[model samples]
Target: GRLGSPVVSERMYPEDGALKSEIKYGLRLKDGGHYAAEVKTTYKAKKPVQLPGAYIVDIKLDIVSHNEDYTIVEQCERAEGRHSTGAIIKEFMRFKVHMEGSVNGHKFEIEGEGEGRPYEAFQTAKLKVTKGGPLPFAWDILSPQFSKAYIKHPADIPDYFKLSFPEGFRWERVVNFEDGGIIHVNQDSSLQDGVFIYKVKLRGTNFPPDGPVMQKKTMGWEA
Candidate 1:
């Protein structure tokens, strides 16, 4: 039978496992709370019923720890694949989280309890920042129908720029908005020169993957 075989599960069949765990540690201040992000990708399934290719799983998290137990937390699961199940699982995981706490961050030296699901492969990570950190900021050209053409992104015109603090300061391009796009940046607090400013980085995503503007750029009058 094509069952109960180590070789079968490893070589012939698909396997399920906790892919990864992520930890984000930030300060919770009055009227302001810092945020951390983590992601875990694991595998599940003993067979490939969709496309003849490998896929990735992602579990995103916003971590919370109180007594060092690494417990008192929130988590969620997400999978990636072209198939219906994989896609459904991915969507099913929308804006939701699960809790696996009291992790005994000391004994097992882990954040969660037990050995998680079987064959459930996973990885873990952590992020930490200090208190009263700097805030986030961004700048960009706000246009939709113009991005497709004029934006020669190897980034000819650095999409975004940043300025740092204190007596001493620094400036740099953080993101480049597409012809029709926007730029955004975020950061933590830092003491530069003499001012307590949030040191930060910029980030942005592409707009109009292909909208009215793109058509006009490629097709011109025809569009």
Candidate 2:
């Protein structure tokens, strides 16, 4: 079977002198297997200005399958400006997605209790920041533990999230739009059980802005 055309929820706009938006993607096969990814940005200004506010980006992915193989089209995008200083205080975190299966060859050490649906063939997609903005940013990733916890992921070329296709699944580029186009995931080169990886990034600045500024960016990959 083959994977479906990617499903996306993307948008960008300014709110009360603040930059806000989200980019989400997912792919699924008819046989019950599926893959989902997201990069969300939430910013709020403080006082009657754009300082002392809050900024957060939650990155995540969810997968459920049984020796499934398929191909898909994927995309990545971003936008930013310098007038509305989005959020001031930055707090980033991710949910844990530890499934009760293995991928390719390695099986993960089961921890806590599963939170979501119980699947025999399952694995999680962890994220790490590849680019950091104007300052240093701390990080944390989380999931349901097992049938149990939650998930988080993005980009900047300083900190980025490294989420790859299932083992054997190739990342073939077909076109380009900022970083958008066809990302073909070949059929047959699929992993049976699991794969895991994670990393973090930096938040913007923490001071009075040059004025009402707006700078926010988000990007994601899929196969």
Candidate 3:
């Protein structure tokens, strides 16, 4: 018995629908003599005519290696195929890649083989910041998937910041009390309108004689 022969030949169809069975062959190859043969056998709503309806596709490989006066020919086949309804279908793939003649005397070989699926999805975002004298000058904007954001600043409102996103997100105007500045509210922790939040600290470190023994600086955010 041939190992790559069909294994199952049974078909069942419900009362309401017509049945059809078909097998399709797809072939692909590379210029370097590497090739793949795909066999697609499917049964739908119809009675199958042959027994052992399942079959496996075979892949043959030809290779040449340097320094070795020899040639190798390998034959490989799919692990599983379809025969009837309720059958478990698994997929496998093989790949080979090589590169030579490097920019500064380099060579590489990249090859792989495995069972999995590949796909792609995309989303985008953007951010920008502007400020002078180091008082939180940067403003950030994040663009969510499938949404647009319009950001603007009022001419007379220096500290006023505003951001308008799609209807799902929050929008507000941020202002600093000391400078009477206005800024658009885009993200959390952007602006504040609170009174005299104060804290004091004093610490001494003797570990490093050259380091500052104690440090003190008055820091406040007016704008």
- Best of the candidates, lDDT: 2
* Per-prediction backbone clash count: 29, 47, 16
TM-score winner, 1 or 2: 2
State candidate 3's TM-score. 0.14
Q: Candidate 2: where is the Cα deviation over 4 Å? A: 1-9, 23-25, 29-39, 43-199, 202-223
Residue 105 CA displacement from its true place in model 3, Å: 45
lDDT for each residue of candidate 1 in 79-178, tens digit (9 for 90 to 100): 1212223311111111111111111020111112211211122212221212211111110011110000111112122111111111212222222222
Off by over 4 Å in 3: 1-23, 29-71, 86-223
For all predictions, the C-alpha RMSD in Å is 23.0, 21.0, 31.8
Q: Which tens-of-lDDT digit does each residue in 1-223 have in candidate 2?
A: 2222223333434454543445554333233443343444432222222222222332233322212111111111111211223411013212232222221222223221122211111223322212221112111011211110111211221111111122221111111112221211111112223322111111222211221111111121333
Give the Å shift of residue 109 in candidate 1: 28
Whole-model alpha-carbon lDDT for candidate 2 = 0.23
**What lDDT score is found at residue 66 in candidate 3?**
16
Tell me how far candidate 3 lies from the true structure as C-alpha RMSD in angstroms: 31.8
Compute each candidate's TM-score over C-alphas. 0.18, 0.19, 0.14
